[PDB]
Design a protein around this nucleic acid. Structure first.
Lengths: 48, 116, 143, 111, 50, 100
RNA sequence: ACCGAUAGUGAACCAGUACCGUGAGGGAAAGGUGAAAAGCACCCCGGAAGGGGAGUGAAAUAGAACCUGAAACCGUGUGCUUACAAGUAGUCAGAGCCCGUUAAUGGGUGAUGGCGUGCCUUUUGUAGAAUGAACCGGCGAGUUACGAUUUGAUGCAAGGUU
RNA sequence: UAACUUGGGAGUCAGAACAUGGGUGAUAAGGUCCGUGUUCGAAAGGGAAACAGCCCAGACCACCAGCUAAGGUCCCAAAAU
RNA sequence: GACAAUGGUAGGAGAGCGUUCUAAGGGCGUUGAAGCAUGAUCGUAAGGACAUGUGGAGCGCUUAGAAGUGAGAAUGCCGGUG
């Protein structure tokens, strides 16, 4: 039926959004830290 | 789809202004000023709720001591006597009977002295 | 919640008289201050005045201890640059015995709106006669 | 019952209008006219016309007598502002506000 | 010397306690019948009697 | 006369023909409950002693099983981005004394 | 499973227009009466603008500065309270006075007592005299494409798959 | 009542005071560099007048219930003139 | 039922609230929808109802899917007003 659709259990998960308030856990710094090269937009160092 | 704001920001800010009814000046009008006062009010209530119990216990002891001084004996000496006899009546009930029935409190004082 | 509270409609105030012959200044003041605050009554209420009026006779002829006659100094300031004044306890006792007793007692009371009013019920007289005979003051024995 | 008159968008600042309005509240009809005619203010001629036009309504649209009338309400509101500019020193300019007001007068027979 | 803090409307209303005008001081003219300024003439007929 | 009873931690003085509020009990609405612990009995008669009076129960009638007014619990830490909000309603029991 | 007038082309209106520069060049703000103009005949205050009646209309506080009409901010009247008092302006306790609800151990105000030095950022450490905000409203920041790895679900299975 | 192994995701590399053993300085510093503990950092509550690091003690929520620690019992200010 | 645990910055893990659009099913509305204002109401939180005034034509509910999905700070941008 098109008005009772249930996906398989354990097969769907909601994504994570950062910078959406402090109660979520990733509000201000969005999981980056404080004042570093890795805390800027543009990446860090090369994989090697 | 473009999700534009509306009827959500306004409905959430007016709840804070309603909680600040009766404040002085802009503290009941402006959301930014009123929001800070509500957080302070909540912090104060949590602290004062537990502090309220200490204040009322100290009031009963003061009234008990004054009533005991009229029988030529002290508060720290009276409470020691009651526990020897095992009266097991708290300060709240001791204070109420010391102003309602002054004759009833005299009976307890005599019993405490008998037990030394 | 059954704790009794006192208000202005069920409070009775009395008048007492105390003589200061051969009493230490601080020891007389310690007991007097507890009477003005109503701490000796069983219906004590911290936010309502429940005290009694106090009359103190013989402000003079009060005794100190040690060398307090000339080694106890009272300072004050007139809010002007360099203006500070002083007086000894011995000089103050014979020039103004009433102000000496008042200051010692009033310093033992809380400095609030209610405390500033409870100190208005104290009467100090240098001699041995008081003009408050219309009331019914009783002699008070110190504990 | 009550008769009223309103004048809208008068080129006078609201703060200056209220100075004369507080002198006529609750006054007699002839007393209020006399006060407005003997004061050397800028809003006195304007307010008087609103009062005299409010008395005319009470005598024509309603069957009242204009000898027991009193002033029950008298207040000034504010309207749109005319925004001008004035050149100051060093090449910059400052804003100038030309404010307007709405003047209302209510006369009541009583009862 | 710029103001350090914003002035609240409680202080502003207190300051304007004495900012007011009063009645001119009018008296009745016993020739015209309506009020006129003291020590002045009646505007309706120009009668400064007495 | 008056009596002193305990209904868990607390102690309260009661008289005949009086409504009291205590903590939640297992009793239903309208049933009859009795207090088996009395520490003091006063009034016109001879004051009874302690720790407990041998006998001398107190009976009362249950009126309702309600809940108290909601209270908000809010705490936060300055400059640390920490806060918490909670609500609490405390159930109670309303009784009316009819015999001591 | 694109926007709905701060969005969508810079431009929903006669916009590359106003306006700014010697010049190349830069570059806006402004949508809505009502189904039908049926857009107030006539009376009163003026010099006029405006207003009060009457009338048209379901509605005129829909009167062309015209659909609804929040906040900052500015004025009028009222119930309680305040001119001996040292205030991050609240919270807990509490007499007195005025009312009556989504009817519940109700609402408004506040004589007195206790406790109590804003928020964010950055710091070993901030009431800090270290930074930021005049106030209110709107907009304003981890997304998509192609590859790699890991976890869960599902189909087949020495085969699986376009 | 925890340790070890293999895999997914991080943050951190400016620390401070107190007690103790030292170097350096001047048996100076709220000085500086090491070893060993506690606390703060990231900890509210009580005491030291106020006072991150000292003493006692680790807040799930509600009550006008009882006993204790550090420090205290003449008045402010609860408890022995 | 019996016992045990529940202070927290950087950061890791889980369960949830609300907004816009789409599919299917089922509803409301000129005897009055959204929006706006007030109220002494409900849940452990983000939040959800009901009544009364204004308003004059659209809007919720259940299960799924998608994202221009949540504002107090950037000497932030635009408009209004002290």
């Amino acid at each position: 039926k098109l008005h009772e659709l249930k996906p398989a259990e354990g097969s769907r998960k909601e994504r994570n959004r950062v910078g959406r308030g402090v109660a979520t856990g990733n509000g201000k710094t969005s999981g980056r830290g404080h004042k570093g090269q890795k805390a800027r937009s543009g990446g860090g160092v090369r994989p090697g | 789809p473009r999700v534009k704001g509306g009827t959500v920001t306004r409905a959430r800010r007016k709840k804070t202004i309603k909680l600040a009814k009766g404040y002085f000046g802009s503290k009941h009008t402006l959301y930014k000023v009123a929001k800070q006062q509500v957080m302070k009010s909540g912090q104060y209530a949590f602290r004062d709720r537990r502090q309220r119990k200490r204040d009322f216990r100290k009031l009963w002891i003061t009234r008990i001591n004054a009533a005991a001084r009229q029988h030529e004996m002290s508060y720290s000496r009276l409470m020691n006597g009651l526990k020897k006899a095992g009266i097991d009546i708290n300060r709240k009930m001791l204070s109420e009977i010391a102003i309602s029935d002054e004759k009833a409190f005299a009976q307890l004082v005599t019993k405490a002295k008998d037990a030394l | 919640r059954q704790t009794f509270m006192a208000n202005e409609s069920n409070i009775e105030r009395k008048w007492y008289v105390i003589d200061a012959e051969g009493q230490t200044l601080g020891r007389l003041s310690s007991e007097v201050a507890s009477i003005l605050r109503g701490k000796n009554k069983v219906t004590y209420t911290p936010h309502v005045d429940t005290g009694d009026y106090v009359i103190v006779i013989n402000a003079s002829k009060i005794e100190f201890t040690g060398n307090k006659e000339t080694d106890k100094v009272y300072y004050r300031h007139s809010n002007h640059p360099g203006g500070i004044k002083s007086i000894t306890a011995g000089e103050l006792r014979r020039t103004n015995p009433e102000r000496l007793i008042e200051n010692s007692i009033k310093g033992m009371l809380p400095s609030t709106r209610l405390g500033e009013k409870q100190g208005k019920k104290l009467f100090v007289y240098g001699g041995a006669e008081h003009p408050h005979a219309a009331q019914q003051p009783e002699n008070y024995e110190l504990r | 019952m009550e008769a009223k008159a309103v004048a809208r968008t008068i080129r006078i600042a609201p703060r200056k209008v209220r100075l004369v309005l507080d002198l006529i509240r609750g006054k007699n009809a002839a007393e209020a006219i006399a006060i407005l005619k003997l004061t050397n203010k800028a809003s006195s001629p304007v307010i008087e016309k609103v009062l005299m036009s409010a008395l005319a309504n009470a005598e024509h649209n309603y069957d009242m007598n204009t000898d027991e009338l009193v002033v029950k309400e008298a207040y000034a509101n504010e309207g749109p502002t005319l925004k001008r500019f004035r050149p100051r020193a060093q090449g910059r300019a400052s804003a100038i506000n030309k404010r307007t007001s709405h003047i209302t007068i209510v006369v009541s027979d009583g009862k | 010397a710029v103001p350090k803090r914003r002035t609240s409307k409680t202080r502003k209303n207190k300051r304007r306690t004495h900012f007011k005008i009063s009645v001119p001081g009018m008296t009745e003219c016993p020739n015209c019948g309506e009020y006129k300024l003291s020590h002045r003439v009646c505007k309706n007929c120009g009668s400064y009697n007495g | 006369m008056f009596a002193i009873i305990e209904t868990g931690g607390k102690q309260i003085k009661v008289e005949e023909g009086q409504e009291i509020f205590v903590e939640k009990l297992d009793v239903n609405e309208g049933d009859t409950f009795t207090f088996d612990k009395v520490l003091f009995v006063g009034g016109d008669s001879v004051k009874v002693g302690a720790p407990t009076v041998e006998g001398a129960t107190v009976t009362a009638t249950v009126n309702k099983q309600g809940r108290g007014k909601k209270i908000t619990v809010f705490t936060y830490k300055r400059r640390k981005n920490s806060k918490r909000k909670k609500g609490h309603r405390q159930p109670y029991t309303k009784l009316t004394i009819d015999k001591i």
